[PDB]
Amino acid sequence: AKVLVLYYSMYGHIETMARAVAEGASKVDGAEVVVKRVPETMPPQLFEKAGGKTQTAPVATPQELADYDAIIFGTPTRFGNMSGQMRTFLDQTGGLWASGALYGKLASVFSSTGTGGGQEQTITSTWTTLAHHGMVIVPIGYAAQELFDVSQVRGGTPYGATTIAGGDGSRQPSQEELSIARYQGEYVAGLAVKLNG
Amino acid sequence: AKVLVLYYSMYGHIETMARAVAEGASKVDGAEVVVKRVPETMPPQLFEKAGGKTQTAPVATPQELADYDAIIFGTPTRFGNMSGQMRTFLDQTGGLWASGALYGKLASVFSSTGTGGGQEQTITSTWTTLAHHGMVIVPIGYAAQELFDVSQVRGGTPYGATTIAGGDGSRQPSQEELSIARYQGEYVAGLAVKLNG
Amino acid sequence: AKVLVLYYSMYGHIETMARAVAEGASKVDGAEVVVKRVPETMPPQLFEKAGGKTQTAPVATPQELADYDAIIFGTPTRFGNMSGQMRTFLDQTGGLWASGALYGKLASVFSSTGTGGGQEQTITSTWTTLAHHGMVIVPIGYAAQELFDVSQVRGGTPYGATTIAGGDGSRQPSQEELSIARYQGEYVAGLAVKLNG
Amino acid sequence: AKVLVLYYSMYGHIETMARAVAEGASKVDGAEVVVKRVPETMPPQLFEKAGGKTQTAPVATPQELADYDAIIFGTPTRFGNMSGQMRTFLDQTGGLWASGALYGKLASVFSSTGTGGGQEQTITSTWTTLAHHGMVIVPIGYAAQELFDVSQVRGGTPYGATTIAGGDGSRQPSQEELSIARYQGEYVAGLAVKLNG
Ligand SMILES: Cc1cc2nc3c(=O)[nH]c(=O)nc-3n(C[C@H](O)[C@H](O)[C@H](O)COP(=O)(O)O)c2cc1C
Ligand SMILES: Cc1cc2nc3c(=O)[nH]c(=O)nc-3n(C[C@H](O)[C@H](O)[C@H](O)COP(=O)(O)O)c2cc1C
Ligand SMILES: Cc1cc2nc3c(=O)[nH]c(=O)nc-3n(C[C@H](O)[C@H](O)[C@H](O)COP(=O)(O)O)c2cc1C
Ligand SMILES: Cc1cc2nc3c(=O)[nH]c(=O)nc-3n(C[C@H](O)[C@H](O)[C@H](O)COP(=O)(O)O)c2cc1C
Q1: Using alpha carbons only, what angle is made at residue B184 by residues B182 and B188, rounded to the nearest 5 degrees?
Q2: Fewest CB atoms within 10 A around its CB: which of B50, B86, C80, C180?
Q3: CATH code of the domain covering residue D114
């Protein structure tokens, strides 16, 4: 019933993917969805310099995560891991861990690169952290038919939606990438409501 | 409701574990639980010359997997991957993958090693394959309190149950190892019924 | 000084990538390079049916691997792992392992998908096995400039060269993919000769 | 010739390990070995209120890494990843990455956990980031005979040395753990000189 899209984005790609994930989840009758971001970690001046890019979404507290039946995580990659900011966040979830606050909750993840390299490693290495919390890990497999389209460069994997930002940052999530993101949101919100309800 | 425990074992360590997993699964009302092994790959002469171990469990067909709501997979490690016989078996699931036969079904893995090294990577890189079928991956987290006991050597991870066989093979699964295994069976069977049901 | 390109290919993509890897290695003055394949695992009739595709390269024995200063491994993916055939092969390397035959030798890997999904997981999960043998693992990082080209669909990652076969198998390794493959071969053969010499 | 031991430690477990790694590295003639820590990320008030542990080691700058031939990285796990402070630090290596400053340099990782769970994944997902800089990743395999001893609880994997801290933090690195650590330092220092030299 309650789905949190929790994300970090520096230049807006993950933010755009997050809104798409939220759209899809919102299609599920019975699903309350909220979008939030993790605290920034680099100093604000440097940030801004930098820089990229102010966000509407409120910053989440670690404690809030207990209020949700499913959490969908988005990070850009940093050399094939989650971003330091998302890492710093998850590192504050000890209290939650000790009480088993997130145990058995649905977790899914989406990311952004690149150039594309690391997009898989970023997701799967995020899953690891989620597993330590005993979260139920939900990949998207091959239901989104766009994953078979190799006629255009295209993010997205069976592990979760992804987007390709361009080495430059100038690319925007394509319709096909967004379509997969939307599918991710709808699927996990559906499974959440099936659970949940 | 239908939970399959599908395993490979050469010397019976995983076999003992599978039984424990099935034991746990059977504590759940409404869970039909069945235990099957994958085909041995080495010619019967070499197996006997190195062995045993002869197994009671029926051998599974790839097609069968479609008939279950949840599948719990066990393998000894081979240098930090699933065994070649588990790999060979899963390589036969192309038909299933193409029709979406395992999509959304619950999956969980347990393994056995050495010595211990590679026990995590075995579970984690098995998850990868399950994610390609779009299976919902279920880790065990730290519900099983035995995971905190560092006073004796002990298999078991938040990713799934493990056992430590010894360089010899001479170790047997300890009470704590089997306790975690039972837990893994009990939990995914419960989820399976909650899904499913 | 001695570089083995060890591969499995069913429909020729990895075979084509392997020859490219070999080309690149062959550019290194002082580098003896040989190309071999691992035994087929599926029955020959079925194979052929199937089927795809007869190879010039001789099939390697596990023992031979000790004769080399560097081994470059190629597999197609099977749901984000190495192929069962490559797995079966590596599973025969126990004797080598026990003597430390491959300890400290250079290892690198390249793969084929898809559609693209699993290309990273396939490489990194192969690295695991190589690490159990204490092989020195060599990724290619971002030296091959083609990795920045997002204007055409393109395999290859910092983990190792890859190729995209098309869901169909109809794609052929593109010039850019081959160029990265060639770079992989030249780089690890270079490092081999630096070692070696 | 120049080997950097670069680590994060909150309670000193990794710190003790780093010293052991440096100890091992120093047995190699021609190896200049230096030990540095990454910046603490939590404000000094919270650190003190939870701590210590105050560290003798100089704090490293991202830029410095360019000055070394080999870098050995240590981190406590955070739910199966590198720590957020190690992540934050490596996220500052963009300049290095862009100029190819760490390309081809030797890399190796060691960690610390719990409890044990996530010790492999921590090393393995650190490798991912190193591979993006095109570092030559060096696992330890099974040269260190202590890796066979399952008669006492014991950190250490073929991917790199580990120590088990206890749920308490109250465990100290055991003689065998440190022995593996020393080995890891000794081996990568030797390779570094062989490269380098
Ligand atoms: C230091 C750091 C490391 C990065 N490493 C990679 C990586 O090696 N592979 C890649 O494709 N992109 C890499 N990038 C790019 C980011 O993943 C990319 O800019 C991000 O997807 C942008 O998404 P956002 O707008 O949501 O912040 C890196 C960026 C930074 C700042
Ligand atoms: C080819 C092969 C590779 C192996 N690699 C490892 C490994 O690197 N790490 C480890 O701890 N044990 C390793 N082992 C030990 C097996 O994982 C062990 O015998 C198995 O867990 C026993 O399970 P079973 O009795 O159910 O067959 C290996 C064994 C074989 C034959
Ligand atoms: C059963 C099996 C599983 C496969 N799984 C995947 C995977 O899910 N992702 C993907 O992109 N391709 C997958 N494929 C495609 C193979 O990786 C692909 O056909 C191979 O790269 C062809 O290379 P080759 O000509 O060297 O054999 C799979 C193929 C088989 C037969
Ligand atoms: C936020 C956080 C997450 C942690 N996650 C794990 C983990 O899941 N598994 C584990 O065994 N220990 C975990 N621990 C324990 C730390 O890894 C342990 O305290 C560390 O290894 C001690 O090393 P140090 O003394 O060098 O700081 C965690 C600790 C913190 C604070």
Answers
A1: 125
A2: B50
A3: 3.40.50.360
